[PDB]
Amino acid sequence: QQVCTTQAETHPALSWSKCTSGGSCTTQAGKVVLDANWRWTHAYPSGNNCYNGNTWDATLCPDDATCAKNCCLEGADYSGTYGVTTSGNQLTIDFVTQSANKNVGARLYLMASDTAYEEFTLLNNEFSFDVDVSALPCGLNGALYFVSMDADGGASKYPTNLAGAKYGTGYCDSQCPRDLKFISGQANVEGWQPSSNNANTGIGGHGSCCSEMDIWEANSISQALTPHPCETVGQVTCSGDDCGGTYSNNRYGGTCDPDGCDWNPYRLGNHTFYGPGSGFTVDTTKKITVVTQFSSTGINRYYVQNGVKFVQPNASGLSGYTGNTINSAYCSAEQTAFGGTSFTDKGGLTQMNKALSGGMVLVLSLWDDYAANMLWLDSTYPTNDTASTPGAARGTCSTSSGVPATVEQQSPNSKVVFSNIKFGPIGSTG
Ligand SMILES: *[C@@H]1O[C@H](CO)[C@@H](O)[C@H](O)[C@H]1NC(C)=O
Ligand SMILES: [Cl-]
Ligand SMILES: [Cl-]
Ligand code: NI
Ligand code: NI
């Protein structure tokens, strides 16, 4: 895509800490950038909208290549349109923001500079952040995660991407998402189908696949930590159903693992660890520090709240696994007990570790779920199962919760607040 400037693009500043072996940390002057899908796209250098509602303009966009030549991305009013603000080391994302239109959430990337995403190599290192999920009810997901995106958004590979990282291009993840309007310097107009339950979204003929490490997906009720490997570490474009993922006729027919080897303490039999108020070990009405440590043998986790350190609880009642670590033994035991082969079919932790040994881009988002109402995170899922089905129970939310139109109407002032990001070798951030 091209770049237009009737709306200025200024990336909100966000401080974070880089720590070194020995525990010295120094402040990094980062910034964040809004994903290109949230932006206004119109004719370059000026003219009609290329995309409006959930359909493309056929004249401007007769094919994928011509569309990208004819259409530009605009700048973003982060606070006024998207409900995104920063202060020092703190980032806030509001759920519903009303201005010209109703905006729902956001997806943002941490930048090293105004033209480059920050690239984190996770293996042998740890990532720490603080989060306030108190204003995230059932059906919402405040997510902090990593994907194997190109640092320049693909600009050096695809000359028709003139927008680059400055405009939040180049997203990919383990779903091989097909809802993206621009992939690898081309529009996704050919075969585009509007969503039946969402006025603003659709599904195109291509998707964008890459490795993904979901450090944090959570609301005030439930949370999960999930590696997702892909057969190719970095970005690849897929076609149609061969993308796999939720919006495809065969979920597992692609090159990424859309399920992942997930660790949700509630799903793993600990129903008192995480939740609102003093009945839980980690009280979700108050700020939580979440630390995640990556090794060739596994992923370890601890929390700090009110100055008190709590390690990840052990899996409870999982046949053949007694630890608290995402390692190959856990991922196999999980598949054996709960079902599925996707994670190991796509190369498991060995393949995940290849992505963790290269640069990954930090993604911060807030979303509601137009496929499954977030029931997979915070309720019983699938709903035709009950608590007696192994792995069915993931949280205490009602099976009727999380319908997007309902949560958007009911809880529009929901928000997530991420802060105090720290990164360095294992043991260095604490
Ligand atoms: C849940 O985790 C807490 C904190 O680690 C622990 O004290 C408690 O025994 C765990 N519950 C079960 C059922 O294992
Ligand atoms: Cl229980
Ligand atoms: Cl419970
Ligand atoms: Ni194609
Ligand atoms: Ni219980």
Short mmCIF file of C-alpha atoms and ligand atoms in Angstrom, two decimals:
data_model
loop_
_atom_site.label_atom_id
_atom_site.label_comp_id
_atom_site.label_asym_id
_atom_site.label_seq_id
_atom_site.Cartn_x
_atom_site.Cartn_y
_atom_site.Cartn_z
CA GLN A 1 0.00 0.00 0.00
CA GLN A 2 0.80 3.68 -0.49
CA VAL A 3 0.90 6.37 2.23
CA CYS A 4 -1.46 9.35 2.58
CA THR A 5 -1.22 12.21 5.06
CA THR A 6 -4.60 13.93 5.51
CA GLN A 7 -4.42 12.29 8.97
CA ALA A 8 -0.97 12.61 10.53
CA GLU A 9 0.80 9.53 11.89
CA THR A 10 2.54 10.04 15.21
CA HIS A 11 3.46 6.94 17.19
CA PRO A 12 2.66 7.16 20.92
CA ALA A 13 5.81 6.92 23.04
CA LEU A 14 6.24 3.94 25.36
CA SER A 15 9.17 3.43 27.72
CA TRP A 16 10.39 -0.08 28.59
CA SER A 17 13.41 -1.62 30.34
CA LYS A 18 16.25 -3.66 28.84
CA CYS A 19 18.01 -5.67 31.54
CA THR A 20 21.41 -7.31 31.36
CA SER A 21 23.09 -10.23 33.07
CA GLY A 22 23.63 -9.09 36.68
CA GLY A 23 20.27 -7.26 36.93
CA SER A 24 21.16 -3.76 35.69
CA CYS A 25 18.30 -2.35 33.57
CA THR A 26 18.17 0.76 31.36
CA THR A 27 15.21 2.66 29.91
CA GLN A 28 14.45 2.22 26.21
CA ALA A 29 12.60 4.95 24.29
CA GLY A 30 10.08 2.83 22.38
CA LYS A 31 6.85 3.66 20.64
CA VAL A 32 3.75 1.85 19.46
CA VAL A 33 2.01 1.65 16.10
CA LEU A 34 -1.52 0.69 15.10
CA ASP A 35 -2.02 -2.31 12.80
CA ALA A 36 -2.89 -1.36 9.20
CA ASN A 37 -6.29 -3.13 9.27
CA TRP A 38 -7.69 -0.51 11.65
CA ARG A 39 -6.71 2.37 9.30
CA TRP A 40 -8.72 4.32 6.75
CA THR A 41 -7.71 3.31 3.21
CA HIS A 42 -8.49 5.54 0.22
CA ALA A 43 -7.33 6.37 -3.28
CA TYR A 44 -3.76 7.68 -3.57
CA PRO A 45 -2.93 10.53 -3.50
CA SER A 46 -6.57 11.38 -2.82
CA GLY A 47 -10.04 10.18 -3.75
CA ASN A 48 -12.67 7.60 -2.86
CA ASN A 49 -12.43 4.93 -0.16
CA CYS A 50 -10.82 1.68 -1.36
CA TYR A 51 -12.54 -0.17 1.47
CA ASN A 52 -15.75 0.89 3.17
CA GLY A 53 -17.92 -1.06 5.58
CA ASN A 54 -16.82 -4.59 4.71
CA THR A 55 -16.45 -4.31 0.89
CA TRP A 56 -13.86 -3.06 -1.59
CA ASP A 57 -14.21 -0.51 -4.41
CA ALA A 58 -14.08 -2.53 -7.66
CA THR A 59 -12.81 0.38 -9.80
CA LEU A 60 -9.86 1.20 -7.50
CA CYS A 61 -9.26 -2.45 -6.61
CA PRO A 62 -9.93 -4.74 -9.63
CA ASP A 63 -7.15 -7.08 -8.48
CA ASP A 64 -4.81 -7.40 -5.49
CA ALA A 65 -1.77 -5.71 -7.12
CA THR A 66 -3.61 -2.78 -8.71
CA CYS A 67 -5.48 -2.13 -5.46
CA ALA A 68 -2.19 -1.78 -3.52
CA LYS A 69 -0.82 0.59 -6.22
CA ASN A 70 -4.00 2.73 -6.17
CA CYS A 71 -4.67 2.79 -2.41
CA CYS A 72 -2.97 4.34 0.59
CA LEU A 73 -3.14 3.92 4.34
CA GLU A 74 -3.84 6.98 6.52
CA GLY A 75 -2.56 8.11 9.89
CA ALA A 76 -4.43 7.33 13.08
CA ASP A 77 -5.87 9.42 15.89
CA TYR A 78 -4.74 6.99 18.60
CA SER A 79 -6.74 8.41 21.53
CA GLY A 80 -9.73 10.01 19.76
CA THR A 81 -10.55 7.21 17.30
CA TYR A 82 -8.83 4.13 18.72
CA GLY A 83 -8.85 4.60 22.52
CA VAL A 84 -5.08 4.08 22.70
CA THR A 85 -3.02 6.21 25.10
CA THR A 86 0.40 6.04 26.72
CA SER A 87 2.08 7.62 29.72
CA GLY A 88 5.69 6.81 30.61
CA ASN A 89 5.91 2.99 30.60
CA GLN A 90 2.10 2.51 30.63
CA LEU A 91 -0.14 1.67 27.64
CA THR A 92 -3.95 1.72 27.82
CA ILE A 93 -6.30 0.23 25.21
CA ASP A 94 -10.01 1.01 25.60
CA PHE A 95 -12.61 -1.47 24.35
CA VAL A 96 -15.25 0.66 22.57
CA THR A 97 -14.35 4.14 21.29
CA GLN A 98 -17.03 6.18 19.52
CA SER A 99 -16.05 9.05 17.23
CA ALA A 100 -17.10 9.08 13.54
CA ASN A 101 -17.71 5.33 13.89
CA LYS A 102 -17.71 2.67 16.60
CA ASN A 103 -14.17 1.29 16.98
CA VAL A 104 -13.65 -1.98 18.88
CA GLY A 105 -10.21 -2.51 20.43
CA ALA A 106 -6.84 -2.33 18.69
CA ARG A 107 -3.73 -4.28 17.76
CA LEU A 108 -0.42 -2.48 18.28
CA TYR A 109 3.27 -3.27 17.71
CA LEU A 110 6.26 -2.08 19.75
CA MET A 111 8.70 -0.10 17.58
CA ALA A 112 12.46 0.43 17.84
CA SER A 113 12.16 3.50 15.58
CA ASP A 114 9.40 5.14 13.52
CA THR A 115 10.31 2.82 10.60
CA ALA A 116 11.19 -0.46 12.42
CA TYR A 117 9.48 -2.87 14.80
CA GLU A 118 11.50 -3.89 17.86
CA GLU A 119 12.71 -7.50 17.50
CA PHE A 120 13.00 -9.67 20.62
CA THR A 121 14.90 -12.97 20.62
CA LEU A 122 13.23 -14.87 23.46
CA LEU A 123 15.20 -18.12 23.93
CA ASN A 124 17.29 -18.12 27.17
CA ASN A 125 15.69 -14.78 28.07
CA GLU A 126 12.67 -13.60 30.04
CA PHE A 127 9.92 -11.08 29.45
CA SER A 128 8.19 -9.27 32.31
CA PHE A 129 5.25 -6.92 32.28
CA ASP A 130 2.65 -5.50 34.61
CA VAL A 131 -1.04 -5.65 33.74
CA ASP A 132 -4.35 -4.42 35.09
CA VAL A 133 -7.13 -6.70 33.81
CA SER A 134 -9.70 -5.47 36.39
CA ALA A 135 -11.81 -3.80 33.68
CA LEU A 136 -11.89 -6.88 31.38
CA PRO A 137 -15.11 -8.86 31.85
CA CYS A 138 -16.17 -12.17 30.32
CA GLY A 139 -15.74 -12.23 26.52
CA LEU A 140 -12.75 -9.84 26.25
CA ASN A 141 -9.10 -10.69 25.60
CA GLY A 142 -6.27 -8.28 26.46
CA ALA A 143 -3.39 -9.99 24.67
CA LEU A 144 0.38 -9.53 24.85
CA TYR A 145 2.25 -11.78 22.46
CA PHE A 146 4.99 -12.32 19.94
CA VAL A 147 4.92 -13.08 16.22
CA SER A 148 7.68 -13.68 13.66
CA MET A 149 6.99 -10.51 11.65
CA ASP A 150 9.54 -8.73 9.46
CA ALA A 151 10.98 -5.63 11.24
CA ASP A 152 10.09 -3.35 8.29
CA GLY A 153 6.61 -4.85 7.79
CA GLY A 154 7.80 -6.50 4.53
CA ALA A 155 8.87 -3.26 2.79
CA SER A 156 12.29 -4.56 1.63
CA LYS A 157 10.75 -7.77 0.26
CA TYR A 158 7.66 -6.25 -1.37
CA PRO A 159 8.30 -2.92 -3.16
CA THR A 160 4.55 -2.17 -3.48
CA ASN A 161 4.47 -1.87 0.34
CA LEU A 162 5.48 1.77 0.67
CA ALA A 163 3.89 2.10 4.12
CA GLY A 164 6.05 -0.39 6.06
CA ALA A 165 6.30 -0.60 9.84
CA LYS A 166 5.38 3.11 10.23
CA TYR A 167 1.78 2.17 9.27
CA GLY A 168 1.61 -1.22 10.97
CA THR A 169 1.86 -3.48 7.90
CA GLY A 170 3.09 -7.08 7.77
CA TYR A 171 1.04 -8.82 10.46
CA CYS A 172 1.03 -12.58 10.59
CA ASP A 173 0.23 -15.13 13.26
CA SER A 174 -0.41 -18.87 13.72
CA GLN A 175 -4.04 -18.63 12.57
CA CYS A 176 -2.81 -17.62 9.09
CA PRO A 177 -5.39 -14.82 9.31
CA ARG A 178 -7.36 -14.10 6.14
CA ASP A 179 -9.14 -10.98 7.51
CA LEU A 180 -6.14 -8.80 6.65
CA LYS A 181 -6.75 -6.20 3.94
CA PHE A 182 -3.07 -5.94 2.95
CA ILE A 183 -0.59 -8.84 2.83
CA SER A 184 2.98 -8.63 1.42
CA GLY A 185 2.40 -5.39 -0.54
CA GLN A 186 -0.87 -6.51 -2.12
CA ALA A 187 -4.50 -6.03 -1.18
CA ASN A 188 -6.66 -9.03 -0.30
CA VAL A 189 -9.56 -8.10 -2.60
CA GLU A 190 -9.73 -11.20 -4.86
CA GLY A 191 -12.30 -13.60 -3.40
CA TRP A 192 -13.13 -11.25 -0.50
CA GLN A 193 -16.28 -12.17 1.41
CA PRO A 194 -17.85 -9.81 3.96
CA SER A 195 -18.49 -11.19 7.45
CA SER A 196 -22.15 -12.06 8.07
CA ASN A 197 -21.95 -10.91 11.74
CA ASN A 198 -19.60 -7.89 11.48
CA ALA A 199 -20.15 -4.73 9.41
CA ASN A 200 -16.43 -3.86 9.32
CA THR A 201 -14.67 -7.17 8.56
CA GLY A 202 -14.37 -9.92 5.96
CA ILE A 203 -12.28 -12.88 4.80
CA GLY A 204 -10.02 -12.77 1.74
CA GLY A 205 -8.46 -15.33 -0.56
CA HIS A 206 -5.08 -15.09 1.17
CA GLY A 207 -3.85 -15.34 4.74
CA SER A 208 -0.64 -14.43 6.53
CA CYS A 209 1.11 -17.20 8.53
CA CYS A 210 3.95 -17.04 11.03
CA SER A 211 5.16 -18.44 14.34
CA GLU A 212 3.48 -17.14 17.47
CA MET A 213 4.22 -17.12 21.20
CA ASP A 214 1.14 -16.09 23.18
CA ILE A 215 2.61 -14.92 26.47
CA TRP A 216 -0.66 -13.47 27.76
CA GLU A 217 -4.28 -13.83 26.74
CA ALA A 218 -6.56 -12.82 29.56
CA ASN A 219 -9.39 -11.02 31.21
CA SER A 220 -10.34 -10.69 34.90
CA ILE A 221 -11.66 -14.31 34.90
CA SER A 222 -9.15 -16.48 32.96
CA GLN A 223 -5.68 -16.41 31.40
CA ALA A 224 -3.59 -18.60 29.08
CA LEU A 225 0.03 -18.99 27.93
CA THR A 226 0.39 -20.69 24.53
CA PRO A 227 3.22 -21.44 22.05
CA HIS A 228 2.07 -22.00 18.41
CA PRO A 229 4.67 -23.34 15.94
CA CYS A 230 4.62 -23.07 12.14
CA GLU A 231 6.45 -25.17 9.52
CA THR A 232 8.12 -21.99 8.28
CA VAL A 233 9.38 -19.74 11.07
CA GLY A 234 8.62 -16.37 9.44
CA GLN A 235 5.89 -14.92 7.25
CA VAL A 236 4.36 -16.94 4.44
CA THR A 237 1.23 -16.17 2.44
CA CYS A 238 -1.33 -18.98 2.23
CA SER A 239 -4.38 -19.50 0.02
CA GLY A 240 -7.96 -20.13 1.09
CA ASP A 241 -8.69 -23.31 3.09
CA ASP A 242 -5.03 -24.33 2.92
CA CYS A 243 -4.48 -21.47 5.46
CA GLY A 244 -6.23 -23.54 8.14
CA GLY A 245 -7.38 -21.69 11.23
CA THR A 246 -10.92 -20.89 12.27
CA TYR A 247 -12.09 -19.37 8.96
CA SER A 248 -11.35 -22.38 6.77
CA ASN A 249 -13.06 -25.68 5.97
CA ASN A 250 -10.11 -27.61 7.52
CA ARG A 251 -8.66 -25.98 10.63
CA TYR A 252 -5.57 -28.27 10.51
CA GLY A 253 -5.01 -28.26 6.75
CA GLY A 254 -2.44 -25.44 6.87
CA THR A 255 1.20 -24.97 7.84
CA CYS A 256 0.71 -23.46 11.34
CA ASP A 257 -0.67 -24.82 14.57
CA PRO A 258 -3.83 -22.79 15.31
CA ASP A 259 -4.50 -24.55 18.65
CA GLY A 260 -1.15 -24.37 20.44
CA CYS A 261 0.15 -26.07 23.56
CA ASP A 262 -1.85 -23.94 26.00
CA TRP A 263 -1.47 -23.51 29.76
CA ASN A 264 -4.56 -22.09 31.50
CA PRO A 265 -4.36 -22.90 35.26
CA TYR A 266 -8.16 -23.29 35.48
CA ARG A 267 -8.27 -25.65 32.51
CA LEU A 268 -5.51 -27.59 34.30
CA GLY A 269 -7.58 -28.07 37.46
CA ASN A 270 -6.65 -25.10 39.64
CA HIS A 271 -9.85 -23.12 40.13
CA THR A 272 -8.60 -20.80 42.92
CA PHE A 273 -5.34 -19.45 41.47
CA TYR A 274 -6.55 -16.56 39.27
CA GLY A 275 -9.69 -14.45 39.61
CA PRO A 276 -11.32 -11.37 41.10
CA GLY A 277 -10.79 -10.63 44.79
CA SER A 278 -9.31 -12.23 47.89
CA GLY A 279 -10.59 -15.75 47.12
CA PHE A 280 -7.82 -16.15 44.56
CA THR A 281 -4.03 -16.40 44.82
CA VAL A 282 -3.64 -13.74 42.12
CA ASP A 283 -6.38 -11.10 42.55
CA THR A 284 -7.44 -9.72 39.17
CA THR A 285 -8.90 -6.51 40.65
CA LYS A 286 -5.28 -5.43 41.27
CA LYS A 287 -2.18 -5.01 39.13
CA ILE A 288 -0.24 -8.21 38.37
CA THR A 289 3.39 -8.66 37.32
CA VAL A 290 3.71 -11.60 34.88
CA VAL A 291 7.17 -13.08 34.18
CA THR A 292 7.78 -15.65 31.45
CA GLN A 293 11.11 -17.47 30.99
CA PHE A 294 12.15 -19.33 27.83
CA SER A 295 14.56 -22.29 27.57
CA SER A 296 15.25 -25.10 25.07
CA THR A 297 13.59 -27.44 27.62
CA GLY A 298 10.52 -25.29 28.31
CA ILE A 299 8.62 -22.18 29.26
CA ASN A 300 8.41 -21.22 32.91
CA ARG A 301 6.15 -18.68 34.57
CA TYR A 302 5.83 -16.74 37.80
CA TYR A 303 3.70 -13.85 39.02
CA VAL A 304 4.31 -11.02 41.48
CA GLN A 305 1.49 -9.20 43.23
CA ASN A 306 1.81 -6.90 46.23
CA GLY A 307 5.50 -7.84 46.28
CA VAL A 308 4.79 -11.55 46.75
CA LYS A 309 6.11 -14.08 44.21
CA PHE A 310 3.86 -17.00 43.20
CA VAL A 311 5.20 -19.59 40.74
CA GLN A 312 2.84 -21.13 38.19
CA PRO A 313 0.77 -23.78 39.99
CA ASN A 314 1.32 -27.41 39.09
CA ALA A 315 -1.08 -29.05 36.66
CA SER A 316 -3.73 -30.75 38.83
CA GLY A 317 -5.23 -34.10 37.87
CA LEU A 318 -3.56 -34.29 34.43
CA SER A 319 -2.70 -37.92 33.68
CA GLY A 320 1.04 -38.42 33.31
CA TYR A 321 2.21 -34.87 34.12
CA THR A 322 2.87 -33.28 37.54
CA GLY A 323 4.95 -30.08 36.86
CA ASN A 324 4.28 -26.40 36.19
CA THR A 325 6.36 -25.99 32.98
CA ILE A 326 5.34 -25.93 29.32
CA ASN A 327 7.75 -28.59 28.12
CA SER A 328 7.48 -31.44 25.62
CA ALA A 329 6.17 -33.80 28.33
CA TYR A 330 3.34 -31.40 29.23
CA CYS A 331 2.36 -30.77 25.61
CA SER A 332 2.17 -34.50 24.92
CA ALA A 333 0.22 -35.21 28.14
CA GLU A 334 -2.19 -32.41 27.23
CA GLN A 335 -2.82 -33.88 23.76
CA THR A 336 -3.24 -37.36 25.24
CA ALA A 337 -5.79 -36.18 27.87
CA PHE A 338 -7.66 -33.44 25.98
CA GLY A 339 -7.27 -34.67 22.38
CA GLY A 340 -5.57 -33.31 19.30
CA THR A 341 -2.26 -33.58 17.48
CA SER A 342 -1.87 -30.09 15.94
CA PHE A 343 0.96 -28.84 18.16
CA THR A 344 3.19 -31.88 17.61
CA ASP A 345 2.11 -32.29 13.95
CA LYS A 346 3.53 -28.81 13.29
CA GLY A 347 6.85 -29.56 15.06
CA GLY A 348 6.09 -28.86 18.73
CA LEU A 349 8.55 -27.08 20.99
CA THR A 350 11.56 -27.84 18.78
CA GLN A 351 9.90 -25.88 15.97
CA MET A 352 8.64 -23.13 18.34
CA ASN A 353 12.21 -22.77 19.61
CA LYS A 354 13.43 -21.92 16.09
CA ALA A 355 11.16 -18.85 16.17
CA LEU A 356 12.27 -18.07 19.73
CA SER A 357 15.89 -18.11 18.41
CA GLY A 358 15.09 -15.35 15.90
CA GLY A 359 13.55 -11.92 16.22
CA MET A 360 9.84 -11.64 17.07
CA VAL A 361 7.64 -8.53 17.25
CA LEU A 362 5.76 -7.62 20.42
CA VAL A 363 2.00 -7.30 19.87
CA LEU A 364 -0.40 -5.67 22.34
CA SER A 365 -4.11 -6.00 21.67
CA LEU A 366 -7.65 -5.94 22.96
CA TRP A 367 -10.37 -7.86 21.14
CA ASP A 368 -13.71 -9.65 21.32
CA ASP A 369 -14.39 -12.89 19.53
CA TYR A 370 -16.76 -12.99 16.54
CA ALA A 371 -16.10 -16.76 16.10
CA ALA A 372 -16.43 -18.31 19.57
CA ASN A 373 -17.32 -15.55 22.11
CA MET A 374 -14.02 -16.14 24.01
CA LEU A 375 -15.60 -19.24 25.57
CA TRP A 376 -12.39 -21.20 24.82
CA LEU A 377 -10.60 -18.86 27.26
CA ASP A 378 -13.07 -18.21 30.09
CA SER A 379 -16.03 -20.64 29.96
CA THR A 380 -16.80 -24.28 29.06
CA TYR A 381 -15.92 -25.09 25.45
CA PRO A 382 -17.24 -26.51 23.25
CA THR A 383 -20.61 -25.77 24.91
CA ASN A 384 -22.08 -29.20 24.01
CA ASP A 385 -19.47 -30.58 26.47
CA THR A 386 -19.69 -29.99 30.21
CA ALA A 387 -17.18 -29.83 33.07
CA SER A 388 -16.86 -33.68 33.05
CA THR A 389 -15.22 -33.63 29.58
CA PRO A 390 -11.40 -33.38 30.01
CA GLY A 391 -10.19 -29.82 29.30
CA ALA A 392 -13.71 -28.49 28.60
CA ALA A 393 -13.81 -26.13 31.61
CA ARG A 394 -11.55 -23.07 31.15
CA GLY A 395 -13.22 -20.53 33.42
CA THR A 396 -16.31 -19.46 35.30
CA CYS A 397 -17.99 -17.34 32.60
CA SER A 398 -21.44 -18.43 31.43
CA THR A 399 -21.61 -20.36 28.17
CA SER A 400 -23.98 -17.58 26.97
CA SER A 401 -21.34 -14.86 27.65
CA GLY A 402 -19.11 -12.94 25.28
CA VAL A 403 -21.40 -12.29 22.33
CA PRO A 404 -19.59 -9.32 20.71
CA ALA A 405 -22.68 -7.15 20.08
CA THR A 406 -23.74 -7.73 23.69
CA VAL A 407 -20.38 -7.05 25.40
CA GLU A 408 -19.82 -3.99 23.19
CA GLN A 409 -23.19 -2.57 24.26
CA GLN A 410 -22.96 -3.65 27.94
CA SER A 411 -19.30 -2.99 28.82
CA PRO A 412 -17.96 -0.41 26.32
CA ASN A 413 -15.66 1.25 28.89
CA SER A 414 -13.75 -1.98 29.46
CA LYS A 415 -10.01 -1.56 29.00
CA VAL A 416 -6.62 -3.19 29.50
CA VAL A 417 -3.54 -1.40 30.92
CA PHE A 418 -0.09 -2.85 30.17
CA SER A 419 2.95 -1.34 31.88
CA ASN A 420 6.56 -1.72 32.97
CA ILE A 421 7.77 -4.04 30.22
CA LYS A 422 11.19 -5.51 31.07
CA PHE A 423 13.31 -7.88 28.98
CA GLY A 424 16.67 -9.58 29.42
CA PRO A 425 18.38 -12.85 30.26
CA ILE A 426 16.64 -15.26 32.59
CA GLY A 427 16.95 -13.88 36.13
CA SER A 428 17.78 -10.32 35.09
CA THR A 429 14.42 -8.45 35.27
CA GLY A 430 13.40 -9.10 38.90
C1 LIG B 1 -3.67 -23.92 43.20
O1 LIG B 1 -2.50 -23.13 43.25
C2 LIG B 1 -2.22 -22.60 44.55
C3 LIG B 1 -1.08 -21.61 44.45
O2 LIG B 1 0.03 -22.28 43.86
C4 LIG B 1 -1.93 -23.76 45.50
O3 LIG B 1 -1.64 -23.27 46.82
C5 LIG B 1 -3.12 -24.72 45.51
O4 LIG B 1 -2.76 -25.88 46.27
C6 LIG B 1 -3.45 -25.13 44.08
N1 LIG B 1 -4.65 -25.96 43.98
C7 LIG B 1 -4.63 -27.23 43.56
C8 LIG B 1 -5.98 -27.90 43.52
O5 LIG B 1 -3.61 -27.84 43.23
CL CL B 2 -12.41 -27.04 42.12
CL CL B 3 -14.85 -22.74 39.90
NI NI B 4 -3.97 -15.87 -4.81
NI NI B 5 -13.97 -25.68 41.18
#
